[PDB]
Tab-separated table of C-alpha atoms in Angstrom:
chain	number	residue	atom	x	y	z
K	1	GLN	CA	4.807	-10.666	-23.307
K	2	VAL	CA	6.048	-7.082	-22.581
K	3	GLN	CA	7.119	-7.385	-18.907
K	4	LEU	CA	8.970	-5.235	-16.332
K	5	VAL	CA	10.256	-6.941	-13.117
K	6	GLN	CA	11.578	-4.902	-10.178
K	7	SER	CA	14.093	-5.857	-7.500
K	8	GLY	CA	12.924	-7.058	-4.079
K	9	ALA	CA	11.756	-4.830	-1.192
K	10	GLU	CA	14.504	-3.053	0.738
K	11	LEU	CA	15.364	-1.289	3.927
K	12	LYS	CA	17.747	1.547	4.666
K	13	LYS	CA	18.717	3.742	7.563
K	14	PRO	CA	17.927	7.448	7.152
K	15	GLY	CA	20.812	9.340	5.517
K	16	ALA	CA	21.615	6.350	3.284
K	17	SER	CA	21.356	5.474	-0.415
K	18	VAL	CA	19.062	2.989	-2.121
K	19	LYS	CA	19.303	1.482	-5.621
K	20	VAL	CA	16.385	-0.219	-7.467
K	21	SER	CA	16.538	-2.223	-10.655
K	22	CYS	CA	13.958	-2.865	-13.318
K	23	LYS	CA	14.468	-5.810	-15.640
K	24	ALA	CA	12.719	-5.745	-19.010
K	25	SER	CA	11.742	-8.678	-21.189
K	26	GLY	CA	9.496	-9.001	-24.221
K	27	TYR	CA	11.250	-5.889	-25.515
K	28	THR	CA	14.528	-4.036	-25.745
K	29	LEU	CA	14.782	-1.654	-22.798
K	30	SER	CA	16.737	1.016	-24.695
K	31	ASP	CA	14.031	1.429	-27.384
K	32	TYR	CA	11.658	3.082	-24.966
K	33	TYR	CA	11.755	5.797	-22.322
K	34	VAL	CA	11.769	4.500	-18.753
K	35	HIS	CA	9.706	6.505	-16.240
K	36	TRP	CA	9.973	6.265	-12.495
K	37	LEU	CA	7.086	7.164	-10.249
K	38	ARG	CA	6.466	6.340	-6.598
K	39	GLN	CA	3.572	5.785	-4.179
K	40	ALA	CA	3.841	6.236	-0.428
K	41	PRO	CA	1.711	3.598	1.348
K	42	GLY	CA	-1.866	4.868	1.382
K	43	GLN	CA	-0.863	8.018	-0.515
K	44	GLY	CA	-0.984	9.043	-4.194
K	45	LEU	CA	1.366	8.671	-7.196
K	46	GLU	CA	4.350	10.990	-7.598
K	47	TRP	CA	6.167	11.077	-10.942
K	48	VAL	CA	9.925	11.117	-10.303
K	49	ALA	CA	11.846	10.831	-13.640
K	50	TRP	CA	12.176	9.883	-17.241
K	51	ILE	CA	15.326	8.517	-18.782
K	52	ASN	CA	16.411	7.928	-22.362
K	53	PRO	CA	18.434	4.663	-22.055
K	54	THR	CA	20.354	5.397	-25.278
K	55	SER	CA	21.539	8.902	-24.429
K	56	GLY	CA	21.372	8.668	-20.663
K	57	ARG	CA	19.417	11.949	-20.744
K	58	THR	CA	17.210	12.282	-17.664
K	59	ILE	CA	14.796	14.912	-16.451
K	60	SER	CA	13.402	14.990	-12.885
K	61	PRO	CA	11.393	17.562	-10.983
K	62	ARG	CA	13.261	20.115	-8.893
K	63	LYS	CA	12.309	18.009	-5.869
K	64	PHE	CA	14.274	14.949	-7.039
K	65	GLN	CA	16.944	16.752	-9.033
K	66	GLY	CA	20.002	16.167	-6.805
K	67	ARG	CA	19.001	12.978	-4.944
K	68	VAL	CA	18.378	10.779	-7.990
K	69	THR	CA	20.782	9.002	-10.356
K	70	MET	CA	19.169	7.043	-13.149
K	71	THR	CA	21.376	4.679	-15.116
K	72	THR	CA	20.933	1.693	-17.410
K	73	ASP	CA	22.758	-1.484	-18.305
K	74	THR	CA	21.174	-2.405	-21.614
K	75	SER	CA	23.573	-5.321	-21.878
K	76	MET	CA	21.302	-6.775	-19.174
K	77	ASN	CA	18.039	-5.030	-20.220
K	78	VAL	CA	18.057	-3.486	-16.729
K	79	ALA	CA	17.242	0.063	-15.593
K	80	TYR	CA	18.435	1.522	-12.289
K	81	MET	CA	17.216	4.167	-9.935
K	82	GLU	CA	19.481	5.404	-7.144
K	83	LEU	CA	18.034	7.641	-4.443
K	84	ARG	CA	20.370	9.427	-1.979
K	85	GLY	CA	19.775	10.912	1.495
K	86	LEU	CA	16.773	8.743	2.354
K	87	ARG	CA	14.442	9.912	5.119
K	88	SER	CA	11.108	8.527	6.327
K	89	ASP	CA	9.258	10.574	3.668
K	90	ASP	CA	11.234	8.560	1.082
K	91	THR	CA	9.292	5.508	2.169
K	92	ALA	CA	7.168	4.174	-0.687
K	93	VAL	CA	6.606	1.716	-3.474
K	94	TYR	CA	8.910	2.680	-6.383
K	95	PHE	CA	7.511	1.863	-9.813
K	96	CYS	CA	9.254	1.782	-13.141
K	97	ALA	CA	7.104	2.121	-16.220
K	98	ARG	CA	7.604	1.966	-19.960
K	99	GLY	CA	6.770	5.104	-21.915
K	100	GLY	CA	7.022	6.126	-25.540
K	101	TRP	CA	9.221	4.941	-28.385
K	102	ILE	CA	12.592	6.681	-28.598
K	103	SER	CA	13.178	8.738	-31.767
K	104	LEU	CA	15.190	11.884	-32.669
K	105	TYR	CA	12.444	13.210	-34.928
K	106	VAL	CA	9.496	12.677	-32.581
K	107	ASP	CA	9.747	13.470	-28.859
K	108	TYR	CA	7.653	11.194	-26.644
K	109	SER	CA	9.796	11.652	-23.514
K	110	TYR	CA	7.311	13.695	-21.449
K	111	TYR	CA	4.295	11.699	-22.668
K	112	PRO	CA	2.662	10.080	-19.604
K	113	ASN	CA	1.709	7.017	-21.665
K	114	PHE	CA	2.777	4.212	-19.358
K	115	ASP	CA	1.671	1.051	-21.216
K	116	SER	CA	3.583	-1.328	-18.909
K	117	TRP	CA	4.425	-1.336	-15.223
K	118	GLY	CA	6.691	-3.173	-12.864
K	119	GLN	CA	5.001	-4.734	-9.818
K	120	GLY	CA	6.669	-2.130	-7.611
K	121	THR	CA	9.544	-2.110	-5.145
K	122	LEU	CA	8.822	-1.245	-1.518
K	123	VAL	CA	11.634	0.646	0.174
K	124	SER	CA	11.428	1.200	3.915
K	125	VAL	CA	13.422	3.682	5.959
K	126	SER	CA	14.271	2.981	9.592
K	127	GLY	CA	17.117	3.827	11.912
K	128	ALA	CA	16.490	0.441	13.538
K	129	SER	CA	19.049	-2.262	14.231
K	130	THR	CA	18.369	-5.981	14.674
K	131	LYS	CA	16.115	-6.655	17.675
K	132	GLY	CA	14.439	-9.790	18.977
K	133	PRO	CA	10.617	-9.788	19.358
K	134	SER	CA	8.600	-9.686	22.557
K	135	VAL	CA	5.822	-12.293	22.355
K	136	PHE	CA	2.636	-11.843	24.440
K	137	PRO	CA	-0.332	-14.204	24.648
K	138	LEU	CA	-3.702	-13.032	23.326
K	139	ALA	CA	-6.141	-14.732	25.767
K	140	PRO	CA	-9.440	-16.104	24.370
K	141	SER	CA	-12.305	-13.614	25.141
K	142	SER	CA	-13.417	-15.643	28.229
K	143	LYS	CA	-16.825	-15.158	26.576
K	144	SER	CA	-15.899	-16.045	22.967
K	145	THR	CA	-15.685	-20.999	18.879
K	146	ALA	CA	-13.046	-18.897	20.565
K	147	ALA	CA	-10.377	-16.549	19.207
K	148	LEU	CA	-6.950	-16.728	20.862
K	149	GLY	CA	-3.508	-15.628	19.633
K	150	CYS	CA	-0.019	-14.151	19.945
K	151	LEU	CA	1.286	-10.577	19.719
K	152	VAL	CA	4.790	-10.319	18.273
K	153	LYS	CA	5.866	-6.895	19.371
K	154	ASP	CA	8.785	-4.590	18.485
K	155	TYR	CA	11.172	-6.716	16.407
K	156	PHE	CA	13.542	-5.986	13.496
K	157	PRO	CA	13.943	-6.875	10.735
K	158	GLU	CA	11.435	-9.149	8.964
K	159	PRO	CA	10.557	-11.907	8.865
K	160	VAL	CA	9.001	-13.394	11.934
K	161	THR	CA	7.625	-16.810	10.959
K	162	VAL	CA	4.825	-18.256	13.083
K	163	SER	CA	3.199	-21.642	13.612
K	164	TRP	CA	0.887	-23.163	16.235
K	165	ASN	CA	1.493	-26.364	18.217
K	166	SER	CA	4.609	-27.028	16.121
K	167	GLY	CA	2.425	-27.225	13.035
K	168	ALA	CA	-0.049	-29.708	14.507
K	169	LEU	CA	-2.695	-26.912	14.305
K	170	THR	CA	-3.186	-25.093	10.952
K	171	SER	CA	-6.949	-24.821	10.535
K	172	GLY	CA	-8.257	-21.325	11.439
K	173	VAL	CA	-4.755	-19.909	11.799
K	174	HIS	CA	-4.334	-16.369	10.498
K	175	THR	CA	-0.908	-14.816	10.915
K	176	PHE	CA	-1.237	-11.137	9.929
K	177	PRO	CA	1.260	-9.104	7.834
K	178	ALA	CA	3.555	-7.105	10.120
K	179	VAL	CA	2.862	-3.384	10.594
K	180	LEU	CA	5.894	-1.124	10.090
K	181	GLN	CA	5.725	1.226	13.058
K	182	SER	CA	6.892	4.822	13.142
K	183	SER	CA	9.483	3.814	15.747
K	184	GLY	CA	10.949	1.759	12.891
K	185	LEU	CA	10.267	-1.646	14.427
K	186	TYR	CA	7.729	-4.277	13.349
K	187	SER	CA	4.841	-5.871	15.157
K	188	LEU	CA	2.535	-8.629	13.982
K	189	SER	CA	-0.077	-10.890	15.385
K	190	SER	CA	-1.172	-14.389	14.683
K	191	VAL	CA	-4.621	-15.532	15.657
K	192	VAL	CA	-6.336	-18.913	15.592
K	193	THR	CA	-10.027	-19.722	16.226
K	194	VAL	CA	-10.690	-22.917	18.154
K	195	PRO	CA	-13.805	-24.771	19.368
K	196	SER	CA	-14.814	-23.223	22.734
K	197	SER	CA	-15.025	-26.490	24.695
K	198	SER	CA	-11.385	-27.215	23.739
K	199	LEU	CA	-10.163	-24.486	26.120
K	200	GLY	CA	-8.854	-25.829	29.429
K	201	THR	CA	-8.151	-29.248	27.892
K	202	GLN	CA	-6.079	-28.555	24.762
K	203	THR	CA	-2.942	-26.503	25.374
K	204	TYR	CA	-2.121	-23.869	22.753
K	205	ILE	CA	1.352	-22.650	21.868
K	206	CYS	CA	2.506	-20.311	19.177
K	207	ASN	CA	5.941	-20.971	17.739
K	208	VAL	CA	7.396	-17.548	16.917
K	209	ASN	CA	10.679	-17.684	15.034
K	210	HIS	CA	12.965	-14.716	14.265
K	211	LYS	CA	16.096	-15.949	12.487
K	212	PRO	CA	17.659	-12.465	12.180
K	213	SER	CA	18.242	-12.371	15.955
K	214	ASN	CA	18.539	-16.169	16.297
K	215	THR	CA	15.664	-16.351	18.782
K	216	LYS	CA	12.844	-18.875	19.027
K	217	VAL	CA	9.847	-18.390	21.309
K	218	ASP	CA	7.218	-21.030	22.003
K	219	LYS	CA	4.598	-19.024	23.915
K	220	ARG	CA	1.910	-20.812	25.856
K	221	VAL	CA	-1.519	-19.199	25.476
K	222	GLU	CA	-4.132	-19.686	28.158
K	223	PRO	CA	-7.466	-18.365	29.409
A	1	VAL	CA	0.066	18.372	-8.069
A	2	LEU	CA	-3.056	18.487	-10.278
A	3	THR	CA	-6.321	18.903	-8.326
A	4	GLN	CA	-8.823	16.033	-8.099
A	5	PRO	CA	-11.946	15.488	-5.912
A	6	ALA	CA	-10.602	13.361	-3.025
A	7	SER	CA	-13.651	11.094	-3.263
A	8	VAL	CA	-16.650	10.372	-5.461
A	9	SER	CA	-19.409	7.823	-4.878
A	10	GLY	CA	-21.888	6.282	-7.335
A	11	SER	CA	-24.201	3.507	-8.571
A	12	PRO	CA	-24.557	1.090	-11.600
A	13	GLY	CA	-25.964	2.015	-15.001
A	14	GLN	CA	-25.933	5.758	-14.219
A	15	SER	CA	-22.810	7.845	-14.949
A	16	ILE	CA	-19.957	9.552	-13.053
A	17	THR	CA	-17.638	12.407	-14.040
A	18	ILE	CA	-14.166	12.730	-12.476
A	19	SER	CA	-12.362	16.086	-12.691
A	20	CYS	CA	-8.744	17.198	-13.002
A	21	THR	CA	-7.614	20.818	-12.680
A	22	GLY	CA	-4.136	22.018	-13.552
A	23	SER	CA	-2.713	25.081	-15.265
A	24	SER	CA	-2.018	26.565	-18.670
A	25	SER	CA	1.528	25.141	-18.471
A	26	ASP	CA	0.312	21.526	-18.518
A	27	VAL	CA	-3.279	20.450	-19.102
A	28	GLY	CA	-4.052	23.653	-20.995
A	29	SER	CA	-1.047	23.559	-23.319
A	30	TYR	CA	-1.135	19.978	-24.573
A	31	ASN	CA	-3.418	17.145	-25.532
A	32	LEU	CA	-1.335	14.886	-23.277
A	33	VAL	CA	-3.719	13.978	-20.460
A	34	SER	CA	-3.706	10.391	-19.205
A	35	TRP	CA	-6.084	8.665	-16.814
A	36	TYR	CA	-4.884	5.783	-14.697
A	37	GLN	CA	-6.936	3.200	-12.811
A	38	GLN	CA	-5.540	1.353	-9.793
A	39	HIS	CA	-6.855	-1.319	-7.385
A	40	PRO	CA	-5.588	-1.823	-3.744
A	41	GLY	CA	-2.681	-4.206	-4.424
A	42	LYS	CA	-1.991	-3.691	-8.106
A	43	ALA	CA	-0.030	-1.120	-10.099
A	44	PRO	CA	-1.788	1.729	-11.973
A	45	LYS	CA	-3.335	0.783	-15.321
A	46	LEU	CA	-3.722	3.033	-18.377
A	47	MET	CA	-7.325	3.735	-19.442
A	48	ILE	CA	-7.346	6.967	-21.454
A	49	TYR	CA	-4.284	8.511	-23.098
A	50	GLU	CA	-3.763	11.823	-24.893
A	51	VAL	CA	-7.004	13.303	-23.453
A	52	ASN	CA	-9.569	11.002	-25.063
A	53	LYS	CA	-7.897	8.028	-26.826
A	54	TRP	CA	-8.709	4.489	-25.667
A	55	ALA	CA	-5.948	2.121	-24.501
A	56	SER	CA	-6.274	-1.527	-25.534
A	57	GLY	CA	-8.837	-3.434	-23.488
A	58	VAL	CA	-10.901	-0.471	-22.285
A	59	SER	CA	-14.683	0.053	-22.662
A	60	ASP	CA	-16.342	3.188	-24.057
A	61	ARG	CA	-17.690	3.330	-20.487
A	62	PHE	CA	-14.634	5.548	-20.015
A	63	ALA	CA	-14.401	8.735	-22.078
A	64	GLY	CA	-11.994	11.625	-21.781
A	65	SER	CA	-12.465	15.329	-22.309
A	66	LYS	CA	-10.725	18.635	-21.647
A	67	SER	CA	-11.969	22.180	-20.969
A	68	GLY	CA	-9.089	24.651	-21.125
A	69	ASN	CA	-7.351	23.608	-17.904
A	70	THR	CA	-9.806	20.955	-16.700
A	71	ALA	CA	-9.504	17.275	-17.638
A	72	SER	CA	-12.532	15.067	-17.169
A	73	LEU	CA	-13.125	11.323	-17.205
A	74	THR	CA	-16.782	10.490	-17.807
A	75	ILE	CA	-17.813	6.891	-17.058
A	76	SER	CA	-21.119	5.316	-18.251
A	77	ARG	CA	-23.040	2.014	-17.943
A	78	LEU	CA	-21.262	1.789	-14.547
A	79	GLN	CA	-20.152	-1.564	-13.184
A	80	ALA	CA	-18.547	-2.460	-9.828
A	81	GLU	CA	-14.926	-3.545	-10.346
A	82	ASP	CA	-13.978	0.133	-10.194
A	83	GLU	CA	-14.411	0.790	-6.453
A	84	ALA	CA	-10.842	2.146	-6.294
A	85	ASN	CA	-8.557	4.860	-7.542
A	86	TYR	CA	-8.405	7.253	-10.493
A	87	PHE	CA	-5.272	9.357	-11.041
A	88	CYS	CA	-4.922	11.959	-13.817
A	89	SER	CA	-1.631	12.963	-15.416
A	90	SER	CA	-0.432	15.573	-17.921
A	91	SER	CA	2.831	16.548	-19.584
A	92	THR	CA	4.159	19.878	-18.398
A	93	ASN	CA	6.190	22.448	-20.286
A	94	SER	CA	9.284	21.700	-18.268
A	95	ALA	CA	9.178	18.364	-20.066
A	96	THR	CA	7.978	16.591	-16.944
A	97	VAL	CA	4.914	14.609	-15.887
A	98	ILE	CA	2.514	15.808	-13.193
A	99	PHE	CA	-0.086	13.605	-11.457
A	100	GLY	CA	-3.338	14.564	-9.779
A	101	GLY	CA	-3.861	13.787	-6.095
A	102	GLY	CA	-6.142	10.839	-6.890
A	103	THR	CA	-9.916	10.513	-6.976
A	104	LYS	CA	-10.571	7.735	-4.450
A	105	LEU	CA	-13.839	6.282	-5.830
A	106	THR	CA	-16.447	4.255	-3.880
A	107	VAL	CA	-19.106	2.781	-6.281
A	108	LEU	CA	-22.098	0.693	-5.090
A	109	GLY	CA	-23.473	-2.141	-7.230
A	110	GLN	CA	-21.753	-5.018	-5.431
A	111	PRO	CA	-22.880	-6.570	-2.150
A	112	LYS	CA	-19.832	-6.580	0.121
A	113	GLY	CA	-17.633	-8.821	2.157
A	114	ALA	CA	-18.029	-7.189	5.577
A	115	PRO	CA	-15.016	-7.289	7.945
A	116	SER	CA	-14.673	-9.725	10.835
A	117	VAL	CA	-13.161	-7.672	13.632
A	118	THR	CA	-11.354	-8.994	16.645
A	119	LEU	CA	-10.139	-6.709	19.421
A	120	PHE	CA	-7.718	-7.956	22.099
A	121	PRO	CA	-7.024	-5.952	25.357
A	122	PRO	CA	-3.456	-5.659	26.742
A	123	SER	CA	-2.237	-9.011	28.075
A	124	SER	CA	-1.516	-9.224	31.829
A	125	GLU	CA	2.067	-10.121	31.018
A	126	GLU	CA	2.429	-6.902	28.981
A	127	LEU	CA	0.862	-4.585	31.556
A	128	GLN	CA	3.108	-6.348	34.115
A	129	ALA	CA	6.043	-5.319	31.928
A	130	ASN	CA	4.780	-1.688	32.022
A	131	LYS	CA	3.408	-1.404	28.446
A	132	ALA	CA	-0.046	-1.871	26.822
A	133	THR	CA	-1.078	-2.700	23.270
A	134	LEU	CA	-4.627	-2.947	22.009
A	135	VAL	CA	-4.779	-5.187	18.939
A	136	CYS	CA	-7.444	-4.971	16.274
A	137	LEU	CA	-7.525	-7.741	13.677
A	138	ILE	CA	-9.621	-7.144	10.603
A	139	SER	CA	-10.258	-9.859	8.065
A	140	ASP	CA	-12.507	-11.196	5.236
A	141	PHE	CA	-13.359	-7.813	3.789
A	142	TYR	CA	-13.980	-6.927	0.162
A	143	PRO	CA	-13.371	-4.525	-1.404
A	144	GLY	CA	-9.959	-3.890	0.178
A	145	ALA	CA	-10.565	-0.383	1.436
A	146	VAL	CA	-10.985	0.328	5.116
A	147	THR	CA	-10.695	3.221	7.555
A	148	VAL	CA	-9.858	2.404	11.190
A	149	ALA	CA	-10.772	4.653	14.149
A	150	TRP	CA	-9.958	4.257	17.822
A	151	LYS	CA	-11.821	5.769	20.785
A	152	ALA	CA	-11.146	5.834	24.521
A	153	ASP	CA	-14.621	5.797	26.019
A	154	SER	CA	-16.597	8.019	23.664
A	155	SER	CA	-13.797	10.313	22.449
A	156	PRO	CA	-11.448	9.688	19.463
A	157	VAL	CA	-7.805	8.719	19.916
A	158	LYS	CA	-5.241	9.290	17.152
A	159	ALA	CA	-1.838	9.017	18.858
A	160	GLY	CA	-0.171	5.634	19.443
A	161	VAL	CA	-1.938	4.110	16.468
A	162	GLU	CA	-0.215	2.018	13.812
A	163	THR	CA	-2.406	0.621	11.031
A	164	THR	CA	-1.426	-1.547	8.080
A	165	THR	CA	-2.627	-0.973	4.566
A	166	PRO	CA	-5.158	-3.598	3.546
A	167	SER	CA	-3.371	-6.585	1.928
A	168	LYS	CA	-4.879	-9.585	0.169
A	169	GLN	CA	-5.928	-12.539	2.251
A	170	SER	CA	-5.664	-15.982	0.768
A	171	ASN	CA	-9.415	-16.031	-0.038
A	172	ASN	CA	-9.459	-13.008	-2.348
A	173	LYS	CA	-10.718	-10.929	0.491
A	174	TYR	CA	-8.515	-8.580	2.500
A	175	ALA	CA	-6.949	-8.241	5.921
A	176	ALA	CA	-5.467	-5.398	7.969
A	177	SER	CA	-4.579	-4.754	11.575
A	178	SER	CA	-4.297	-1.796	13.857
A	179	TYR	CA	-2.333	-1.351	17.044
A	180	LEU	CA	-3.034	1.116	19.877
A	181	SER	CA	-0.126	1.817	22.263
A	182	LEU	CA	-1.132	2.793	25.787
A	183	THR	CA	0.411	3.287	29.203
A	184	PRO	CA	-1.011	0.715	31.645
A	185	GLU	CA	-2.354	3.695	33.568
A	186	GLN	CA	-4.289	4.952	30.537
A	187	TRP	CA	-5.783	1.453	29.988
A	188	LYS	CA	-6.784	1.088	33.666
A	189	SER	CA	-8.226	4.602	33.894
A	190	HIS	CA	-10.994	4.360	31.265
A	191	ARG	CA	-14.404	2.696	31.092
A	192	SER	CA	-13.353	1.251	27.705
A	193	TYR	CA	-11.415	1.461	24.435
A	194	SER	CA	-12.971	0.715	21.051
A	195	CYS	CA	-11.744	-0.188	17.618
A	196	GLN	CA	-14.097	0.808	14.813
A	197	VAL	CA	-13.613	-0.408	11.246
A	198	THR	CA	-15.406	1.498	8.491
A	199	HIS	CA	-15.820	-0.313	5.200
A	200	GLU	CA	-18.422	0.696	2.624
A	201	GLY	CA	-20.445	3.264	4.554
A	202	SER	CA	-20.977	0.554	7.160
A	203	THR	CA	-19.117	0.323	10.452
A	204	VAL	CA	-18.208	-2.466	12.825
A	205	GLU	CA	-17.101	-1.587	16.349
A	206	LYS	CA	-15.482	-3.886	18.875
A	207	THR	CA	-15.126	-2.702	22.492
A	208	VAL	CA	-12.981	-3.912	25.427
A	209	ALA	CA	-12.739	-2.866	29.111
A	210	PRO	CA	-10.487	-3.403	32.149
């Protein structure tokens, strides 16, 4: 029953602030140290702070000593982390974790005993502004069942939703998670495998939809 | 950062030792070493705490020791659901926590779940619009760890590459994708480009040409 639930993924321009929350249930947040670590995608863990929710006392490494502001709202069993001056190296999953029991007579603050984790909160950094996608057909191999698809290139922000033949084709459809490019934009692709003899007779269309720029693209794919 | 071996590889039954090297101001000066286990999508999980003590729900497979400034996690009667990451951590004397760089482990007692790879060349409509994107779609692989390499002809290519981290497919296997950005002139002026996905020592390579 001890559970920590973090706020949803976020996105900030470089030079901007982010704030992440961490809701506790199954226990009283202020009875235990809260630790914050972080994990850049495909990188390792970096411990970033501990905070005593009763006193407000908070130690961070020299690295995070002026950028970070930990706070709590124990009325809500919520912990907060605020990180200033974001840059692309600030891009990672931020984890909160529950550490030792808080007591004046025994110090467990710096104990790395994290017996409970949040699921993590992805923060992305990008100087990118809304942008509609460019949709290109992915022609079936001409050799090839047959794989065909759609490339949904250089859009912002998420999500692009995708269907095929207005939903009349679902079997063998695989729409891939978007990659977050260094340019700051997203691309994704959606691929479907179809019987080879269906080419030339069955038309195929991917229905790309990007609400954030109010665009809809129904792209015809062909050999 | 505490120093770990970037990678260790093993086999069932037999044992593995993972190392952690710090300083007298952390690992040497306390019995506060903790070993964390983490799998591709999940959050880290506590195995060993305070050097050697067992966390709830952890086998004696895992044991913890310390030699002056070196922490070690010995693992015995090996299984296969490891296949992922081991991070070490120690209190410091500045009242902080320091983590090791992460032993990325690669056990072998499971079969696999080899990746289906699909490589698409730039579309005519894209080249026509003076860009080019090679798309490499990688699916159905388990365990969710992959390295992706691109080559133009026979030689490696590292610029213009964006590659996702592996994320769970709806089958309890994994997917990822990798994009190669090219100038239409680059694309035209090569025998071929290739996407090569490396999984568990094994490699799959898909190749396209203009």
